[PDB]
């Protein structure tokens, strides 16, 4: 069985209320995806080389090209004998209504999800996006004026909500509580350095856990490491 | 009488309240000029200096407000 690319159209920014779907009659030959990171590149005087600082990660980009053909030589994947694709205008109409026009209840275009069977973009099985660019070329016409072939080129950009973005960045910092078990070879200042980046806090940790002698630890003790105070 | 400003490359021995000789600018500006101010700029490894010649003609009290307001502003 041959699987086809599908575009799902949603109204909710949490992608829960599905409005519709469109299926491509011919799969694309290829597509491309683009990534980028942004750093600070200022440099000190008369210095050899540099160590740039991180600023942010930009949204990903997606490029796609495909074709509609209605001259009667491309079969329809429905199992009936003698069937071929013969209507371009209907497909252009439903496509433009689904991905391009304004929604009368939200006053903007719909949210899109791109899915191709078992394809994986990464840690997910779909691409959540919005349409930014589209071009159509009509290259073959009927004697009454109706088209027989159309070629489309599209550019999509990545979209993800605020609430969900801050949860994907599961920021772990000295802003949370840690717990560690003591094993053979462990010492308190080294554990403190490995959690806080500074051994100097060791005397505080011993007080939080009630340690009388902190230079000889037992090997089944579970130690708690509290967060740091918000402003010093 | 004559006021002016000159930009040149880095000059370690620059000082104010001295004389310099200015030349190459015609009969009406050549001669000995009096230095009033200096700026040093070091940006990204480059070094240049600016030399200001002449004094402004206005009195000090005509440019600043150095007296309080009536009724002490109450």
């Amino acid at each position: 069985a041959l699987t086809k690319v599908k575009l799902l159209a949603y109204q909710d920014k949490r992608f829960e209320n599905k409005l519709g779907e469109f299926e491509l009659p011919i799969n694309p030959e290829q597509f491309s995806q683009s990534f980028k990171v942004e750093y600070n590149r200022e440099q000190a005087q008369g210095s050899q080389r540099n160590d740039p600082e991180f600023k942010f990660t930009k949204p990903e980009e997606l490029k796609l090209d495909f074709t509609f053909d209605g001259t009667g030589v491309v079969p329809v994947n429905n199992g009936k004998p003698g069937e071929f694709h013969q209507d371009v205008a209907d497909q252009v109409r439903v496509f433009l209504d689904l991905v391009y026009s304004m929604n009368s209840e939200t006053h903007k275009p719909n949210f899109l999800r791109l899915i191709w069977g078992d394809f994986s973009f990464g840690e997910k099985n779909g691409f959540d996006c919005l349409l930014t660019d589209l071009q159509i070329n009509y290259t073959l016409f009927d004697q009454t004026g109706k088209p027989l072939r159309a070629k489309l080129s599209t550019t999509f950009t990545s979209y993800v909500e605020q609430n969900r973005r801050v949860r994907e960045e599961g920021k772990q910092s000295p802003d949370v509580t840690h717990q560690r078990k003591v094993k053979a070879g462990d010492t308190l200042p080294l554990m403190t350095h490995r959690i806080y980046g500074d051994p100097a806090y060791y005397l505080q940790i011993a007080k939080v856990n009630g340690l009388i002698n902190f230079r000889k630890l037992a090997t089944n003790t579970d130690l708690r490491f509290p967060p740091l105070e918000k402003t010093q | 009488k004559i006021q002016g400003r000159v930009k040149t490359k880095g000059y370690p021995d620059a000082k104010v309240d001295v004389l310099i000789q200015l030349a190459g600018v015609g009969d009406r500006f050549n001669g000995l000029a009096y230095v009033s101010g200096i700026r040093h700029e070091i940006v990204g490894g480059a070094w240049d200096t600016h030399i200001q010649m002449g004094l402004p003609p206005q009195w000090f009290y005509q440019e600043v407000d150095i007296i309080d307001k009536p009724a002490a502003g109450l």
Binding site: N40, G46, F54 | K9, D13, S36, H40, W47
Partner: protein, 70 residues
């Protein structure tokens, strides 16, 4: 103008704070100095600082660049 007996023309500077040389402890971007007659001398210093991943300004929290120092 260039001093005599200069074998190389690399320009250098030094920034002391309470007697301690702190030139190579930070990233210095620019320095400007003004000496004018009938006015008070002035200087302005620009350093690179700040990091969004660490959420702090490390040289601001130091003890070398706080108001009141020589």
């Amino acid at each position: 103008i260039i001093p005599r007996n200069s074998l190389y023309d690399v320009a250098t500077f030094k920034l002391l704070s309470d007697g301690k040389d702190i030139t190579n402890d930070y990233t210095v971007l620019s320095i400007t100095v003004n000496q004018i007659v009938n006015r008070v001398p002035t200087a302005r210093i620009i350093l690179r600082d700040g990091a969004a991943a660490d959420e702090t300004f490390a040289a601001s929290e130091g003890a070398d660049l706080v108001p009141g120092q020589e």
